[PDB]
Amino acid sequence: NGDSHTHPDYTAGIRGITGNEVTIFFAPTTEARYVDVHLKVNNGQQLNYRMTERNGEWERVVENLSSGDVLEYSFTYEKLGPQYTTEWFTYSR
Ligand SMILES: [Br-]
Ligand SMILES: [Br-]
Ligand SMILES: [Br-]
Ligand SMILES: [Br-]
Numbered sequence: 001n002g003d004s005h006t007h008p009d010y011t012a013g014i015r016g017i018t019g020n021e022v023t024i025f026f027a028p029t030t031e032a033r034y035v036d037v038h039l040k041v042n043n044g045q046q047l048n049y050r051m052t053e054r055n056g057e058w059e060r061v062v063e064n065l066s067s068g069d070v071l072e073y074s075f076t077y078e079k080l081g082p083q084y085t086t087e088w089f090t091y092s093r
Contacts, residue, residue: 005089009079014071014091022065022093026051026058026075033078038088040072041065065093 016023
């Protein structure tokens, strides 16, 4: 049930889907000094978080999406000094 999106700089998407959580992941092709995620649920307010780094990947757990919840998410990632921001991706729980 997870989703992946690919760009030469990254694979990113949703993984780790359980009844009470999903994980937004961002796996860059070049090591990043930091990655932020921007998210909204059912078109609510935008929330911004520094992702957690683990083994060269970056993660954010989103808890308590009910079935039918729409999660929209974008990233700002560092690469070799500057940072870059993606489009908004969509996931339906
Ligand atoms: Br893909
Ligand atoms: Br690298
Ligand atoms: Br944060
Ligand atoms: Br967009």
